[PDB]
Amino acid sequence: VLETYVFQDNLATAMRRDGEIYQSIVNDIYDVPRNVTITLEDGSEKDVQLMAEVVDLATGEKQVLNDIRGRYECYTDVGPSFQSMKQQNRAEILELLGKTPQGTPEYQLLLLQYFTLLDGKGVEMMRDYANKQLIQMGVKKPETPEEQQWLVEAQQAKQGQQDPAMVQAQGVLLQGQAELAKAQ
Amino acid sequence: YDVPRNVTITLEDGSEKDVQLMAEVVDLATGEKQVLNDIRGRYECYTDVGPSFQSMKQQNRAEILELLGKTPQGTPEYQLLLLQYFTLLDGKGVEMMRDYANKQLIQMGVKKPETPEEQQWLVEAQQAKQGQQDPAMVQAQGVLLQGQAELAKAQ
Amino acid sequence: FQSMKQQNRAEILELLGKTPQGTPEYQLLLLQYFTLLDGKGVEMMRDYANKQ
Amino acid sequence: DVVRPVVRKLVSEMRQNPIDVLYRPKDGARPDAADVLMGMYRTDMRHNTAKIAVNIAVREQIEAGVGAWRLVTDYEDQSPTSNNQVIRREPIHSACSHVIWDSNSKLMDKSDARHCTVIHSMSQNGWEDFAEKYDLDADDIPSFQNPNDWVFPWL
Amino acid sequence: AVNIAVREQIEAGVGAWRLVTDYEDQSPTSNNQVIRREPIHSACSHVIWDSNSKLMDKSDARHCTVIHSMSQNGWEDFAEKYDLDADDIPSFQNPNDWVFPWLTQDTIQIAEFYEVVEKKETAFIYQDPVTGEPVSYFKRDIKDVIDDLADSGFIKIAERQIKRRRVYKSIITCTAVLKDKQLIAGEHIPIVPVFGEWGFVEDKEVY
């Protein structure tokens, strides 16, 4: 003429080459677990990840990995730099919030952003609150048994205790006039 | 290349509905190597010009974003938003949102459940909608129907 | 236009630009979803529009 | 220089609007007939080589006025696109002198051309690599018309 | 390293990186190993790519030479790290000149020669007992030490030839090769080039 756009795209291609080389090195030295989601028993355990990893310990010395040819399941791309996966997920949630109006998904995204919030215990209160809210809504899968207890409490509170008002009153009328039938 | 052909079939007494099968025919030569099998019905696509995408998922995401830009905030807007959440990125940070969107779309019945957990979700949606969600004023006025029919029976 | 589907889609878009947000607007939106592109990413919306 | 900033601006403007093929079905084709071929095209033409070739052709078109590509078939045993084979788009540098189109072609895309000659300039080690790849005799050094001159005093 | 490459690309027009494998006993990324991206200064003169490569990312290049300029103590450090004879001072082509009257300039310089070869390799097909009928594929060149141990638990279904690229590094001097064909983990040359106004004019690279 940004002026540094062609120099930016060249850097992007360099990053793509770096990603390809890194993927090759990872497949060659690193341990790459394979997701083996299974539904054992009579349909029990649902669809849950297991993250199977296979390693062999040589009797002589050292260990060498076991990676299948199903290794190139990811294609390199270009994106903003992040220090860790949590920051990447937080940026995803913020972008989605910017891409979502103030409806039920907006509250969902806000709670999910509170899920991936920082380390300090100053926000531990809201981390726990967001966990509890998401679990009580049933969208989240409870892992630790206290979350299962929260889910059970939510189920008991929703069922029976929160009786619909006008529907139950009109059911009252139903019962009463059925009695009028019985008494003719 | 090997180009599969869509052979959508309705076998049995109208069962199995319209579902794709993506039939692919390959011959393994007894001597060595394999040779493809492609019919002359190959030029079923005409070349056009569009923006470059790294993968088909990005193309579908761009389609959904354009449709959102072309749709007001109605029921189709929610449908498009849920479908955009369907084709979201790889990270498990949005796994909860992907699962929620899948469950919502299946409960509305627009989506076809493939894995049996989705079929279970659809079954729960059907049970919740039928009977449990009794219309309020309609049921009250049916009450009045019953009561005054009783007034008829008692004269 | 490259094909007849593109011509019909342009017709529907122009008519939508010539229609207020009433029942015909929903009709035209559903008809636009009818003639939408090939990818199965929009197969759900194509089927939903056909059903509606 | 007073012309080079203009060339840089044009190249940047052309690079900010990437273009790629977008297959669409025929008038009577199925509403999902073009998905598989389009997906395989995205699979093959997503590596760095395709983007670099397109950028080289665009830069030469801005500067020289002509650019060219070349699609070649190759065997990939690990992660193949289809049928143990992949398609890549390698670049051609100085397409004005290294690509010899038919003189009877009257179309911009050169689809009327009934023959084409591509001149390859490679180093000695490149010559042995080429001979090994195509099963040629590396001892017999080839010769052809020199596409480029020696106006600049290259070492 | 990225910032150095960017600055050189802005100024000189070319930059480069290097991905190296190393063993980290405390806090490793995976398999008691880590990967880091060391920088390369003056990539124009210290990285000599193949002349037959016609791609900006230099993926077509089948070999690459990286020239290292290091001080004396750096030379003993290099010799100790790579198990070399520090007494024999190496020598190579001087990537840098002495146009500026520097009070002293580096003398000990050595070069590492990267090369990649694409050849079909023998891969053994195994049956993972845990997964169940998974037709797992593993390469013989990697697990030649544990073929016997893998047979104790896995089932060798069949044999197949899979074509893959292997990267070899050889530390060289102008008089002898100190290390010859040391296998590198990656499937590509680790040096990642960054270019600016790249292009070819008369079969000669101009950036």
PDB file of N, CA and C in Angstrom, chain D residues 17-102:
ATOM      1  N   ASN D  17      -7.206 -11.568  -2.046  1.00  0.00           N
ATOM      2  CA  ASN D  17      -8.446 -12.166  -2.538  1.00  0.00           C
ATOM      3  C   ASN D  17      -8.111 -13.505  -3.178  1.00  0.00           C
ATOM      4  N   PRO D  18      -7.850 -14.533  -2.371  1.00  0.00           N
ATOM      5  CA  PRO D  18      -7.524 -15.845  -2.936  1.00  0.00           C
ATOM      6  C   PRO D  18      -8.708 -16.442  -3.680  1.00  0.00           C
ATOM      7  N   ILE D  19      -8.397 -17.224  -4.708  1.00  0.00           N
ATOM      8  CA  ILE D  19      -9.391 -17.872  -5.554  1.00  0.00           C
ATOM      9  C   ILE D  19      -9.034 -19.344  -5.691  1.00  0.00           C
ATOM     10  N   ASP D  20     -10.053 -20.200  -5.687  1.00  0.00           N
ATOM     11  CA  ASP D  20      -9.863 -21.623  -5.922  1.00  0.00           C
ATOM     12  C   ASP D  20     -11.082 -22.167  -6.649  1.00  0.00           C
ATOM     13  N   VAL D  21     -10.912 -23.353  -7.238  1.00  0.00           N
ATOM     14  CA  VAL D  21     -12.015 -24.008  -7.927  1.00  0.00           C
ATOM     15  C   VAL D  21     -13.140 -24.303  -6.939  1.00  0.00           C
ATOM     16  N   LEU D  22     -14.376 -24.292  -7.443  1.00  0.00           N
ATOM     17  CA  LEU D  22     -15.563 -24.614  -6.644  1.00  0.00           C
ATOM     18  C   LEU D  22     -16.502 -25.423  -7.536  1.00  0.00           C
ATOM     19  N   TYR D  23     -16.410 -26.746  -7.436  1.00  0.00           N
ATOM     20  CA  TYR D  23     -17.238 -27.620  -8.254  1.00  0.00           C
ATOM     21  C   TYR D  23     -18.696 -27.547  -7.820  1.00  0.00           C
ATOM     22  N   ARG D  24     -19.593 -27.527  -8.799  1.00  0.00           N
ATOM     23  CA  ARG D  24     -21.026 -27.515  -8.566  1.00  0.00           C
ATOM     24  C   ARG D  24     -21.695 -28.549  -9.458  1.00  0.00           C
ATOM     25  N   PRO D  25     -22.818 -29.112  -9.025  1.00  0.00           N
ATOM     26  CA  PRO D  25     -23.478 -30.151  -9.818  1.00  0.00           C
ATOM     27  C   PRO D  25     -24.197 -29.578 -11.030  1.00  0.00           C
ATOM     28  N   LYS D  26     -24.496 -30.470 -11.971  1.00  0.00           N
ATOM     29  CA  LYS D  26     -25.208 -30.098 -13.183  1.00  0.00           C
ATOM     30  C   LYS D  26     -26.647 -29.708 -12.850  1.00  0.00           C
ATOM     31  N   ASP D  27     -27.390 -29.296 -13.880  1.00  0.00           N
ATOM     32  CA  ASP D  27     -28.790 -28.938 -13.679  1.00  0.00           C
ATOM     33  C   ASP D  27     -29.607 -30.139 -13.219  1.00  0.00           C
ATOM     34  N   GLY D  28     -29.412 -31.290 -13.854  1.00  0.00           N
ATOM     35  CA  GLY D  28     -30.110 -32.504 -13.497  1.00  0.00           C
ATOM     36  C   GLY D  28     -29.377 -33.419 -12.546  1.00  0.00           C
ATOM     37  N   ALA D  29     -28.215 -33.013 -12.046  1.00  0.00           N
ATOM     38  CA  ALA D  29     -27.438 -33.853 -11.152  1.00  0.00           C
ATOM     39  C   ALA D  29     -28.048 -33.857  -9.753  1.00  0.00           C
ATOM     40  N   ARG D  30     -27.579 -34.791  -8.931  1.00  0.00           N
ATOM     41  CA  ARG D  30     -28.079 -34.910  -7.574  1.00  0.00           C
ATOM     42  C   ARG D  30     -27.654 -33.699  -6.744  1.00  0.00           C
ATOM     43  N   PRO D  31     -28.448 -33.329  -5.734  1.00  0.00           N
ATOM     44  CA  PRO D  31     -28.078 -32.192  -4.877  1.00  0.00           C
ATOM     45  C   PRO D  31     -26.814 -32.407  -4.062  1.00  0.00           C
ATOM     46  N   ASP D  32     -26.207 -33.596  -4.101  1.00  0.00           N
ATOM     47  CA  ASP D  32     -24.988 -33.863  -3.346  1.00  0.00           C
ATOM     48  C   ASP D  32     -23.965 -34.617  -4.188  1.00  0.00           C
ATOM     49  N   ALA D  33     -24.029 -34.464  -5.512  1.00  0.00           N
ATOM     50  CA  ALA D  33     -23.142 -35.209  -6.398  1.00  0.00           C
ATOM     51  C   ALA D  33     -21.729 -34.641  -6.421  1.00  0.00           C
ATOM     52  N   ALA D  34     -21.572 -33.347  -6.159  1.00  0.00           N
ATOM     53  CA  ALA D  34     -20.286 -32.680  -6.303  1.00  0.00           C
ATOM     54  C   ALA D  34     -19.465 -32.656  -5.022  1.00  0.00           C
ATOM     55  N   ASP D  35     -19.931 -33.299  -3.951  1.00  0.00           N
ATOM     56  CA  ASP D  35     -19.252 -33.154  -2.667  1.00  0.00           C
ATOM     57  C   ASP D  35     -17.939 -33.930  -2.624  1.00  0.00           C
ATOM     58  N   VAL D  36     -17.925 -35.162  -3.137  1.00  0.00           N
ATOM     59  CA  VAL D  36     -16.749 -36.011  -2.964  1.00  0.00           C
ATOM     60  C   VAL D  36     -15.574 -35.494  -3.788  1.00  0.00           C
ATOM     61  N   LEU D  37     -15.820 -35.117  -5.045  1.00  0.00           N
ATOM     62  CA  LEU D  37     -14.742 -34.602  -5.880  1.00  0.00           C
ATOM     63  C   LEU D  37     -14.233 -33.271  -5.345  1.00  0.00           C
ATOM     64  N   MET D  38     -15.142 -32.424  -4.859  1.00  0.00           N
ATOM     65  CA  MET D  38     -14.732 -31.152  -4.277  1.00  0.00           C
ATOM     66  C   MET D  38     -13.883 -31.369  -3.030  1.00  0.00           C
ATOM     67  N   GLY D  39     -14.271 -32.331  -2.192  1.00  0.00           N
ATOM     68  CA  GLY D  39     -13.484 -32.630  -1.009  1.00  0.00           C
ATOM     69  C   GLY D  39     -12.104 -33.154  -1.347  1.00  0.00           C
ATOM     70  N   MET D  40     -12.011 -34.014  -2.361  1.00  0.00           N
ATOM     71  CA  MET D  40     -10.699 -34.500  -2.779  1.00  0.00           C
ATOM     72  C   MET D  40      -9.856 -33.382  -3.385  1.00  0.00           C
ATOM     73  N   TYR D  41     -10.489 -32.440  -4.090  1.00  0.00           N
ATOM     74  CA  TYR D  41      -9.747 -31.287  -4.596  1.00  0.00           C
ATOM     75  C   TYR D  41      -9.201 -30.440  -3.455  1.00  0.00           C
ATOM     76  N   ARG D  42     -10.022 -30.181  -2.434  1.00  0.00           N
ATOM     77  CA  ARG D  42      -9.523 -29.473  -1.257  1.00  0.00           C
ATOM     78  C   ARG D  42      -8.404 -30.249  -0.576  1.00  0.00           C
ATOM     79  N   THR D  43      -8.503 -31.579  -0.557  1.00  0.00           N
ATOM     80  CA  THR D  43      -7.459 -32.390   0.059  1.00  0.00           C
ATOM     81  C   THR D  43      -6.135 -32.235  -0.680  1.00  0.00           C
ATOM     82  N   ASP D  44      -6.160 -32.353  -2.008  1.00  0.00           N
ATOM     83  CA  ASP D  44      -4.917 -32.283  -2.773  1.00  0.00           C
ATOM     84  C   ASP D  44      -4.354 -30.868  -2.803  1.00  0.00           C
ATOM     85  N   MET D  45      -5.192 -29.881  -3.117  1.00  0.00           N
ATOM     86  CA  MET D  45      -4.732 -28.502  -3.288  1.00  0.00           C
ATOM     87  C   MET D  45      -4.899 -27.697  -1.997  1.00  0.00           C
ATOM     88  N   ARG D  46      -4.260 -28.195  -0.939  1.00  0.00           N
ATOM     89  CA  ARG D  46      -4.177 -27.470   0.319  1.00  0.00           C
ATOM     90  C   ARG D  46      -2.760 -27.348   0.853  1.00  0.00           C
ATOM     91  N   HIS D  47      -1.782 -28.009   0.242  1.00  0.00           N
ATOM     92  CA  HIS D  47      -0.407 -27.942   0.700  1.00  0.00           C
ATOM     93  C   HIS D  47       0.225 -26.618   0.279  1.00  0.00           C
ATOM     94  N   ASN D  48       1.474 -26.412   0.696  1.00  0.00           N
ATOM     95  CA  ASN D  48       2.161 -25.165   0.379  1.00  0.00           C
ATOM     96  C   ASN D  48       2.485 -25.055  -1.103  1.00  0.00           C
ATOM     97  N   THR D  49       2.688 -26.186  -1.784  1.00  0.00           N
ATOM     98  CA  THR D  49       3.122 -26.141  -3.176  1.00  0.00           C
ATOM     99  C   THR D  49       2.074 -25.485  -4.072  1.00  0.00           C
ATOM    100  N   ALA D  50       0.791 -25.777  -3.845  1.00  0.00           N
ATOM    101  CA  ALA D  50      -0.258 -25.193  -4.676  1.00  0.00           C
ATOM    102  C   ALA D  50      -0.338 -23.684  -4.482  1.00  0.00           C
ATOM    103  N   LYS D  51      -0.311 -23.232  -3.225  1.00  0.00           N
ATOM    104  CA  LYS D  51      -0.364 -21.801  -2.952  1.00  0.00           C
ATOM    105  C   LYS D  51       0.849 -21.087  -3.532  1.00  0.00           C
ATOM    106  N   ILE D  52       2.034 -21.684  -3.391  1.00  0.00           N
ATOM    107  CA  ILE D  52       3.242 -21.062  -3.923  1.00  0.00           C
ATOM    108  C   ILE D  52       3.182 -20.986  -5.443  1.00  0.00           C
ATOM    109  N   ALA D  53       2.690 -22.042  -6.097  1.00  0.00           N
ATOM    110  CA  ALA D  53       2.568 -22.014  -7.551  1.00  0.00           C
ATOM    111  C   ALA D  53       1.602 -20.928  -8.005  1.00  0.00           C
ATOM    112  N   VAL D  54       0.457 -20.811  -7.328  1.00  0.00           N
ATOM    113  CA  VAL D  54      -0.509 -19.776  -7.690  1.00  0.00           C
ATOM    114  C   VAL D  54       0.091 -18.392  -7.487  1.00  0.00           C
ATOM    115  N   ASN D  55       0.808 -18.193  -6.378  1.00  0.00           N
ATOM    116  CA  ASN D  55       1.418 -16.893  -6.115  1.00  0.00           C
ATOM    117  C   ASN D  55       2.478 -16.553  -7.155  1.00  0.00           C
ATOM    118  N   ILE D  56       3.284 -17.540  -7.555  1.00  0.00           N
ATOM    119  CA  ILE D  56       4.303 -17.304  -8.575  1.00  0.00           C
ATOM    120  C   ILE D  56       3.652 -16.917  -9.895  1.00  0.00           C
ATOM    121  N   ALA D  57       2.598 -17.639 -10.281  1.00  0.00           N
ATOM    122  CA  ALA D  57       1.911 -17.311 -11.526  1.00  0.00           C
ATOM    123  C   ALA D  57       1.299 -15.919 -11.468  1.00  0.00           C
ATOM    124  N   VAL D  58       0.707 -15.556 -10.329  1.00  0.00           N
ATOM    125  CA  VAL D  58       0.100 -14.234 -10.196  1.00  0.00           C
ATOM    126  C   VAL D  58       1.162 -13.144 -10.284  1.00  0.00           C
ATOM    127  N   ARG D  59       2.299 -13.342  -9.615  1.00  0.00           N
ATOM    128  CA  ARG D  59       3.367 -12.347  -9.667  1.00  0.00           C
ATOM    129  C   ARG D  59       3.909 -12.192 -11.081  1.00  0.00           C
ATOM    130  N   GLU D  60       4.107 -13.307 -11.787  1.00  0.00           N
ATOM    131  CA  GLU D  60       4.593 -13.225 -13.162  1.00  0.00           C
ATOM    132  C   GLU D  60       3.563 -12.571 -14.074  1.00  0.00           C
ATOM    133  N   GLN D  61       2.276 -12.842 -13.842  1.00  0.00           N
ATOM    134  CA  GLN D  61       1.227 -12.204 -14.628  1.00  0.00           C
ATOM    135  C   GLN D  61       1.213 -10.698 -14.401  1.00  0.00           C
ATOM    136  N   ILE D  62       1.411 -10.268 -13.154  1.00  0.00           N
ATOM    137  CA  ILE D  62       1.507  -8.840 -12.866  1.00  0.00           C
ATOM    138  C   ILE D  62       2.713  -8.238 -13.575  1.00  0.00           C
ATOM    139  N   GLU D  63       3.857  -8.919 -13.508  1.00  0.00           N
ATOM    140  CA  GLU D  63       5.100  -8.353 -14.024  1.00  0.00           C
ATOM    141  C   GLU D  63       5.320  -8.685 -15.499  1.00  0.00           C
ATOM    142  N   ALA D  64       5.429  -9.973 -15.826  1.00  0.00           N
ATOM    143  CA  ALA D  64       5.727 -10.360 -17.201  1.00  0.00           C
ATOM    144  C   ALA D  64       4.474 -10.383 -18.067  1.00  0.00           C
ATOM    145  N   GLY D  65       3.354 -10.834 -17.512  1.00  0.00           N
ATOM    146  CA  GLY D  65       2.110 -10.946 -18.245  1.00  0.00           C
ATOM    147  C   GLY D  65       1.667 -12.366 -18.517  1.00  0.00           C
ATOM    148  N   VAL D  66       2.473 -13.364 -18.164  1.00  0.00           N
ATOM    149  CA  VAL D  66       2.133 -14.763 -18.394  1.00  0.00           C
ATOM    150  C   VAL D  66       2.638 -15.599 -17.223  1.00  0.00           C
ATOM    151  N   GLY D  67       1.866 -16.626 -16.862  1.00  0.00           N
ATOM    152  CA  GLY D  67       2.263 -17.576 -15.842  1.00  0.00           C
ATOM    153  C   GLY D  67       1.697 -18.939 -16.173  1.00  0.00           C
ATOM    154  N   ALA D  68       2.239 -19.965 -15.517  1.00  0.00           N
ATOM    155  CA  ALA D  68       1.822 -21.330 -15.806  1.00  0.00           C
ATOM    156  C   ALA D  68       1.974 -22.205 -14.570  1.00  0.00           C
ATOM    157  N   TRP D  69       1.261 -23.327 -14.585  1.00  0.00           N
ATOM    158  CA  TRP D  69       1.297 -24.354 -13.550  1.00  0.00           C
ATOM    159  C   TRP D  69       1.640 -25.692 -14.199  1.00  0.00           C
ATOM    160  N   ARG D  70       1.558 -26.758 -13.409  1.00  0.00           N
ATOM    161  CA  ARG D  70       1.681 -28.111 -13.946  1.00  0.00           C
ATOM    162  C   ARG D  70       1.139 -29.088 -12.919  1.00  0.00           C
ATOM    163  N   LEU D  71       0.167 -29.899 -13.322  1.00  0.00           N
ATOM    164  CA  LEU D  71      -0.412 -30.925 -12.466  1.00  0.00           C
ATOM    165  C   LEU D  71       0.194 -32.272 -12.836  1.00  0.00           C
ATOM    166  N   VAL D  72       0.832 -32.922 -11.869  1.00  0.00           N
ATOM    167  CA  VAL D  72       1.460 -34.215 -12.098  1.00  0.00           C
ATOM    168  C   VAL D  72       0.890 -35.230 -11.121  1.00  0.00           C
ATOM    169  N   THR D  73       0.914 -36.491 -11.538  1.00  0.00           N
ATOM    170  CA  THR D  73       0.437 -37.605 -10.738  1.00  0.00           C
ATOM    171  C   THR D  73       1.611 -38.242 -10.007  1.00  0.00           C
ATOM    172  N   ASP D  74       1.354 -38.712  -8.789  1.00  0.00           N
ATOM    173  CA  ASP D  74       2.412 -39.300  -7.984  1.00  0.00           C
ATOM    174  C   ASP D  74       1.802 -40.341  -7.059  1.00  0.00           C
ATOM    175  N   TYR D  75       2.638 -41.275  -6.619  1.00  0.00           N
ATOM    176  CA  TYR D  75       2.224 -42.341  -5.718  1.00  0.00           C
ATOM    177  C   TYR D  75       2.654 -41.999  -4.300  1.00  0.00           C
ATOM    178  N   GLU D  76       1.692 -41.988  -3.381  1.00  0.00           N
ATOM    179  CA  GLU D  76       1.941 -41.709  -1.971  1.00  0.00           C
ATOM    180  C   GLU D  76       1.435 -42.896  -1.166  1.00  0.00           C
ATOM    181  N   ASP D  77       2.358 -43.639  -0.554  1.00  0.00           N
ATOM    182  CA  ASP D  77       1.974 -44.850   0.162  1.00  0.00           C
ATOM    183  C   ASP D  77       1.329 -44.534   1.505  1.00  0.00           C
ATOM    184  N   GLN D  78       1.788 -43.487   2.183  1.00  0.00           N
ATOM    185  CA  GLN D  78       1.246 -43.083   3.473  1.00  0.00           C
ATOM    186  C   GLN D  78       0.388 -41.839   3.297  1.00  0.00           C
ATOM    187  N   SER D  79      -0.839 -41.899   3.803  1.00  0.00           N
ATOM    188  CA  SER D  79      -1.816 -40.823   3.670  1.00  0.00           C
ATOM    189  C   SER D  79      -2.041 -40.416   2.211  1.00  0.00           C
ATOM    190  N   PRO D  80      -2.566 -41.312   1.377  1.00  0.00           N
ATOM    191  CA  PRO D  80      -2.887 -40.938   0.000  1.00  0.00           C
ATOM    192  C   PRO D  80      -4.269 -40.318  -0.108  1.00  0.00           C
ATOM    193  N   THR D  81      -4.437 -39.490  -1.140  1.00  0.00           N
ATOM    194  CA  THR D  81      -5.736 -38.866  -1.367  1.00  0.00           C
ATOM    195  C   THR D  81      -6.766 -39.895  -1.813  1.00  0.00           C
ATOM    196  N   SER D  82      -6.412 -40.725  -2.793  1.00  0.00           N
ATOM    197  CA  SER D  82      -7.295 -41.777  -3.279  1.00  0.00           C
ATOM    198  C   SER D  82      -6.500 -42.716  -4.171  1.00  0.00           C
ATOM    199  N   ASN D  83      -6.789 -44.015  -4.061  1.00  0.00           N
ATOM    200  CA  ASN D  83      -6.180 -45.045  -4.906  1.00  0.00           C
ATOM    201  C   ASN D  83      -4.654 -45.022  -4.813  1.00  0.00           C
ATOM    202  N   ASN D  84      -4.141 -44.789  -3.603  1.00  0.00           N
ATOM    203  CA  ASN D  84      -2.700 -44.761  -3.348  1.00  0.00           C
ATOM    204  C   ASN D  84      -1.989 -43.763  -4.258  1.00  0.00           C
ATOM    205  N   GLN D  85      -2.652 -42.642  -4.536  1.00  0.00           N
ATOM    206  CA  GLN D  85      -2.097 -41.623  -5.412  1.00  0.00           C
ATOM    207  C   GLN D  85      -2.566 -40.254  -4.948  1.00  0.00           C
ATOM    208  N   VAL D  86      -1.743 -39.239  -5.217  1.00  0.00           N
ATOM    209  CA  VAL D  86      -2.068 -37.856  -4.903  1.00  0.00           C
ATOM    210  C   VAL D  86      -1.747 -36.988  -6.112  1.00  0.00           C
ATOM    211  N   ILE D  87      -2.365 -35.811  -6.145  1.00  0.00           N
ATOM    212  CA  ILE D  87      -2.157 -34.827  -7.200  1.00  0.00           C
ATOM    213  C   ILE D  87      -1.626 -33.552  -6.561  1.00  0.00           C
ATOM    214  N   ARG D  88      -0.532 -33.027  -7.105  1.00  0.00           N
ATOM    215  CA  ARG D  88       0.061 -31.794  -6.616  1.00  0.00           C
ATOM    216  C   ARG D  88       0.238 -30.818  -7.770  1.00  0.00           C
ATOM    217  N   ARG D  89       0.325 -29.538  -7.420  1.00  0.00           N
ATOM    218  CA  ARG D  89       0.440 -28.440  -8.377  1.00  0.00           C
ATOM    219  C   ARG D  89       1.782 -27.746  -8.146  1.00  0.00           C
ATOM    220  N   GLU D  90       2.827 -28.229  -8.820  1.00  0.00           N
ATOM    221  CA  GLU D  90       4.128 -27.594  -8.668  1.00  0.00           C
ATOM    222  C   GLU D  90       4.227 -26.365  -9.571  1.00  0.00           C
ATOM    223  N   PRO D  91       5.069 -25.396  -9.221  1.00  0.00           N
ATOM    224  CA  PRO D  91       5.153 -24.164 -10.006  1.00  0.00           C
ATOM    225  C   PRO D  91       6.082 -24.288 -11.207  1.00  0.00           C
ATOM    226  N   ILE D  92       5.897 -23.360 -12.142  1.00  0.00           N
ATOM    227  CA  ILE D  92       6.767 -23.210 -13.302  1.00  0.00           C
ATOM    228  C   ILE D  92       7.281 -21.780 -13.304  1.00  0.00           C
ATOM    229  N   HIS D  93       8.599 -21.624 -13.228  1.00  0.00           N
ATOM    230  CA  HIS D  93       9.218 -20.309 -13.198  1.00  0.00           C
ATOM    231  C   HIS D  93       9.565 -19.858 -14.609  1.00  0.00           C
ATOM    232  N   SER D  94       9.354 -18.569 -14.875  1.00  0.00           N
ATOM    233  CA  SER D  94       9.582 -17.977 -16.192  1.00  0.00           C
ATOM    234  C   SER D  94       8.796 -18.733 -17.265  1.00  0.00           C
ATOM    235  N   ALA D  95       7.471 -18.719 -17.105  1.00  0.00           N
ATOM    236  CA  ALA D  95       6.595 -19.435 -18.023  1.00  0.00           C
ATOM    237  C   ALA D  95       6.631 -18.862 -19.431  1.00  0.00           C
ATOM    238  N   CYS D  96       7.126 -17.635 -19.598  1.00  0.00           N
ATOM    239  CA  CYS D  96       7.215 -17.047 -20.929  1.00  0.00           C
ATOM    240  C   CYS D  96       8.169 -17.831 -21.820  1.00  0.00           C
ATOM    241  N   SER D  97       9.319 -18.234 -21.279  1.00  0.00           N
ATOM    242  CA  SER D  97      10.328 -18.938 -22.053  1.00  0.00           C
ATOM    243  C   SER D  97      10.426 -20.421 -21.733  1.00  0.00           C
ATOM    244  N   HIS D  98       9.910 -20.862 -20.589  1.00  0.00           N
ATOM    245  CA  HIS D  98       9.996 -22.263 -20.205  1.00  0.00           C
ATOM    246  C   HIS D  98       8.765 -23.069 -20.594  1.00  0.00           C
ATOM    247  N   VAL D  99       7.715 -22.424 -21.091  1.00  0.00           N
ATOM    248  CA  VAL D  99       6.515 -23.106 -21.565  1.00  0.00           C
ATOM    249  C   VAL D  99       6.289 -22.696 -23.011  1.00  0.00           C
ATOM    250  N   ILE D 100       6.267 -23.679 -23.909  1.00  0.00           N
ATOM    251  CA  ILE D 100       6.117 -23.414 -25.334  1.00  0.00           C
ATOM    252  C   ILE D 100       4.758 -23.915 -25.798  1.00  0.00           C
ATOM    253  N   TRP D 101       3.771 -23.026 -25.820  1.00  0.00           N
ATOM    254  CA  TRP D 101       2.426 -23.406 -26.215  1.00  0.00           C
ATOM    255  C   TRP D 101       2.323 -23.533 -27.731  1.00  0.00           C
ATOM    256  N   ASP D 102       1.260 -24.197 -28.174  1.00  0.00           N
ATOM    257  CA  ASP D 102       1.002 -24.330 -29.601  1.00  0.00           C
ATOM    258  C   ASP D 102       0.684 -22.969 -30.206  1.00  0.00           C
TER     259      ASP D 102
END
